[PDB]
Amino acid sequence: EYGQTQKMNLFQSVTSALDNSLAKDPTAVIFGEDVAFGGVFRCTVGLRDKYGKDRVFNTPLCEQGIVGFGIGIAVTGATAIAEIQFADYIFPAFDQIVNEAAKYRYRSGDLFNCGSLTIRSPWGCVGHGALYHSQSPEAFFAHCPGIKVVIPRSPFQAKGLLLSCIEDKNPCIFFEPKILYRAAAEEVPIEPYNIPLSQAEVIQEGSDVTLVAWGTQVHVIREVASMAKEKLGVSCEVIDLRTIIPWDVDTICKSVIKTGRLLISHEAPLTGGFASEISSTVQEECFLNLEAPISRVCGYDTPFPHIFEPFYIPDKWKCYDALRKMINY
Amino acid sequence: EYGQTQKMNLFQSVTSALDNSLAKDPTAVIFGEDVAFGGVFRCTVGLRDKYGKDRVFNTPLCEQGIVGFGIGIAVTGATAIAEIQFADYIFPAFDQIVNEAAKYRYRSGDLFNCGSLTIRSPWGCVGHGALYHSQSPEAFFAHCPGIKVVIPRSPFQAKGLLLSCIEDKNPCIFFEPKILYRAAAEEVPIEPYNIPLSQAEVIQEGSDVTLVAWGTQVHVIREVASMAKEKLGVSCEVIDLRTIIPWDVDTICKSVIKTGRLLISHEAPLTGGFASEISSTVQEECFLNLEAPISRVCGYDTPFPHIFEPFYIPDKWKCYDALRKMINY
Amino acid sequence: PQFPGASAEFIDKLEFIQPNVISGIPIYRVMDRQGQIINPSEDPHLPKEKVLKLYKSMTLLNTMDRILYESQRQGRISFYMTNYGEEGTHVGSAAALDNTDLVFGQYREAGVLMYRDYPLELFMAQCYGNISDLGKGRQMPVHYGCKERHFVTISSPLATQIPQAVGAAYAAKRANANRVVICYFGEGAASEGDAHAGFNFAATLECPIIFFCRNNGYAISTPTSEQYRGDGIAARGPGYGIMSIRVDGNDVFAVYNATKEARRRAVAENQPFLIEAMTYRDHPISRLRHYLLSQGWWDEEQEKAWRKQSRRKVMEAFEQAERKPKPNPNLLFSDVYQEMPAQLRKQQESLARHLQTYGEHYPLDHFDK
Amino acid sequence: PQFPGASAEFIDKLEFIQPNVISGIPIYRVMDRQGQIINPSEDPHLPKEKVLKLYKSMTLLNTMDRILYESQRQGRISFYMTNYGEEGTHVGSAAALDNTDLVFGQYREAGVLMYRDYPLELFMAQCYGNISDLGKGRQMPVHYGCKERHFVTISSPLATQIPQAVGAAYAAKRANANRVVICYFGEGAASEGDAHAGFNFAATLECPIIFFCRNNGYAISTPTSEQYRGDGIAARGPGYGIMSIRVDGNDVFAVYNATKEARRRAVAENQPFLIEAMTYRDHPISRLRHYLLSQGWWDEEQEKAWRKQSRRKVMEAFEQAERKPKPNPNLLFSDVYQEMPAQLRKQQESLARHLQTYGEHYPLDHFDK
């Protein structure tokens, strides 16, 4: 399909995407905190030695600076691949992302843009990350027209989606699920390939219920589908959303028209979470097909706790229980 | 009901709330950009002369500083009433609001808090404010457990809700609809009074459809109700949400159980807007009562334009047309 | 001492370092208030044609300011920011740049565009949001931008352009084509976190950038006593390792000299420079007029004739700008992303349907169709 | 000159101001590497009991660090940050404060708590997230806080405590009860926008605050050559109008003297002070031990006995912390707001129902019930 592959974990797939980018795009640079020695999650190992200190370099410890600086590089047309060390620390840059990067093209009438900016950042829970190593900030960004927000579920998916973000002519935030960085490897093409943005993937066809998630939570719902089949004889259609905005409304609505039931799950808190946008849209488009209320199985509306993590996360049992109730509605 | 009143516009009602606060709470201080001479929207006129330069004072031009500084005052138990000059410029402070203020009490096990912080800021469209004088950022904050977000619709409502925010033991963001600052006056009690947080107000009873909005948009839906009665013989129940988080789920659900139809409207963009949270919750709680899909009539998913404002806003005709379609569904 | 964080000797006595604020960094001046050159070795001896261009650019800006400020008082345009007191800082610094040097700024930088021959029609088009506006009428007035003249579109949030300008300078360094970036901001904006980000990044990443701070003593109602307590903005530069100077912003020649030298060294050395120009919230136009008279390069008749000609050119652009239609309302949806997402196109189609039915309630009259 | 923004003379020659980075602000030292007092007029002549407390606080911290660092290597606790090299900066500065002075910090400040007699049980309880943790097990390890000892709970986002500490100092000034605030941060954290916010606000709002920057030459993998290009952090202070000093962070007496004087003047004058203490990422404990020996205040036998006693006390706290249950899982919902919103209580009830049915799949075993 895509030429020679090798087994890669998710951090290795990110390095491969970045390597491929720097090799084919002489403008491209990578920068942020501690990227020069390879990064705190090893995603940039070897790249400075290979491409040069002017192309893979450390910034001062200042997130608002990192994003501002990246926007300026992109204004000149050069590819700017910024790192924010944990997604929890993206908030100092919120003004540069929301007021500047997202609005740059619109407000100038397309005289200027920062389309060649990508911001990548580790994301999601990790077992013990507590309040500031665990967050899933995608719903904060979903309300900002002019940026794209993309989240992969695996090494193969990560490299193809990240290459798409780097090449896309719009500022992109790419969230890397950190609990997958050294999880199982899979085969990943060594050469560049792209997976389209704003396109969901039906990874398992089903007839009774649609399940939607992204990131690590795709694996949870995949297991929920298995539990529902074995324990309930229920056939689940499992969808990875992949791009948060602009999202693939059509694929989700087509699925729900077929199944008549939808359960959306994410690690982020329930209130104002992105499940609310999917639920409200699907209700609008698929109203007459809905056999049961759309269910959202999300993190609680609290900060992300340390010792309590096993009780906080929308795990397979929480998803399964909600599904059982929805099937019985 | 509340003692002597006088006619006040919304800016005057905010000054009255602030005056009442400083008079009864010796700890209380007000600070931000240009507040000393009375503020760019006159909300602090006379307060420095009355209460002293140590209590009503200008900060340097630094929003992340303003919020950080306010949190520190509140950590000592003193009442800190910060101003952000336009809600569009709250984003530099997003990290201090979301990572710090909202989480302060939880993460310390209640050893420390910043409950005595209120952040007030002009909000909403104003006819010609374009991208950075017009924004409605409430959905960005709605996804953050630990803060409250409150928006009034009138001078009477503003003073009672602002006094509640200042006195509430949690960090509050109070958004003042700037297009109302010098709009019509109404009678406002001169002495302090409170309107409860997390409580919606049914301002007109109706039987066929529930309409929900907040801020200036309450007046739009009030007019939509009048248009629907006259043109369609349709009876609308009109609700002002008032508090965005924690929101009054019960009042909205009780209304929709009665009417079977819901239209939510806000100036903020559709995608990830707070209407999505209300819609998804009401669908979950009132599923079997829903006669028609819940409708959201919102700003478009663009930045807020200058010359195009009349075409952007979810005005009474846009709301009415959506309502007509929903009644006909 | 053997500490990696600093290069310093030991001291055996406790002594706090005191800021010198009472006698701060001195203010560089080339000509006095009577337009006389103070120190001949500092005179740039700019040719007559160039100095007349400086003068006519400042005065034409001032003519335009008077007219558009009145237009705003009448509600003909929704907003306006004048350039009074800032004509010298902007025209003097622009003249010291190469035409292709990239400019970032905010609300006081229209003189840079005027010096770069930005058409009066296009200043007007942006303030009216009309069909000629390349910004498509989407931003509030005076939010100018020009790709052809390398002037990055202004945005309202203060200081956001500062770390951006540093990123564009880094990119320029890598591109290796002898270009500088200049970044303008006020002394109020310098309090923002993004100023600290941009000053530090430019030093550690070795960027060919001029930071140009205009210090007029006020940010809206806030005097500088409430804005900072050090020796203005110039005294901050050395703390970041940035070469820094303070100049008399009412003196176009002092502004020009400092900008010319900062540009020369920034490009050659890949290092940032900070210029703080002191102005008032003794005017740059008066001072330069005195200079012209001493050279025999201007007189009352020429002054009268140019006042007339410049008023005529501004009024011609003004009247034309007012009579142009606004852009098609469809343009509120394009450029949000480069492409239009299908869901956004659905919102555009919904507006088109809406206007078909309810159009009488909208000002469709002076919008393009 | 007549400009409101700065107080300065004119200069008639163009001269950029150059940073002095090669010979920076000198490093204050009281005792040499052999523990000898260098300049008798600077000796604080602290009494024996107090100096032994400094020594025993540093060493007890070091004992605890060794054990908890091993605990982390084994996965017994999830995370740990040591205090190696920072024992002198923290214990020396804490000893110069009044017991009620409010402390803000981050990851290197456990010595301040140790000097303030924070129980070993409570350091342990926080790192294990057990039932004794007043933080209720909600934050990652080493995120300490104590209301009774005026040490504001640490948070992971760098530099956010800096403008907060300034606000608490302003509030203290108004309360008029002779209290200072101290705020600790690293030289990496000083690059954050919030550092520029806090330094400037403290100067313009005249706040009784000590900013204590620990400069160890590195922020994770980043050497200071990539962090800044001025003369460390101390050279930034004067640009904000802040009195500033640099000290040898391996010298508890130099740290103590500078902190004592900064506290005295900050409270009296309502003005901020900046201390930059140079450390390594020649150790503070060794140096102080040499001093004790010269006074005849310590010897090998006492050293042996205290090493034993301190290991015993830490191991007793360690074993007890490991055997305590974790808090009730219900505690994940309280304190989000002061009250619990009804919708949040609904989520709590949903977890209780969930555990009733699926509890076998959760570690209910070592959680309180």
Ligand SMILES: Cc1ncc(C[n+]2csc(CCOP(=O)(O)OP(=O)(O)O)c2C)c(N)n1
């Ligand atoms: C982030 C942000 N906060 C506040 C404002 C409101 N504002 C517009 S101009 C101004 C004063 C700016 O002062 P200065 O930078 O000194 O420039 P000057 O107006 O004196 O030329 C303020 C506070 C803004 N545009 N952006």
Ligand SMILES: Cc1ncc(C[n+]2csc(CCOP(=O)(O)OP(=O)(O)O)c2C)c(N)n1
């Ligand atoms: C806003 C933010 N960005 C990044 C981090 C990740 N981080 C944790 S410690 C650290 C280095 C801090 O260096 P410094 O302030 O010099 O303190 P030191 O570790 O040297 O004592 C970084 C980048 C963080 N906690 N917060």
Ligand SMILES: [Cl-]
């Ligand atoms: Cl503004």
Ligand SMILES: [Cl-]
């Ligand atoms: Cl961290």
Ligand SMILES: [K+]
């Ligand atoms: K991109």
Ligand SMILES: [K+]
């Ligand atoms: K409050």
Ligand SMILES: [K+]
């Ligand atoms: K700007």
Ligand SMILES: [K+]
């Ligand atoms: K912190």
Ligand SMILES: [Mn+2]
């Ligand atoms: Mn100014």
Ligand SMILES: [Mn+2]
């Ligand atoms: Mn460090």
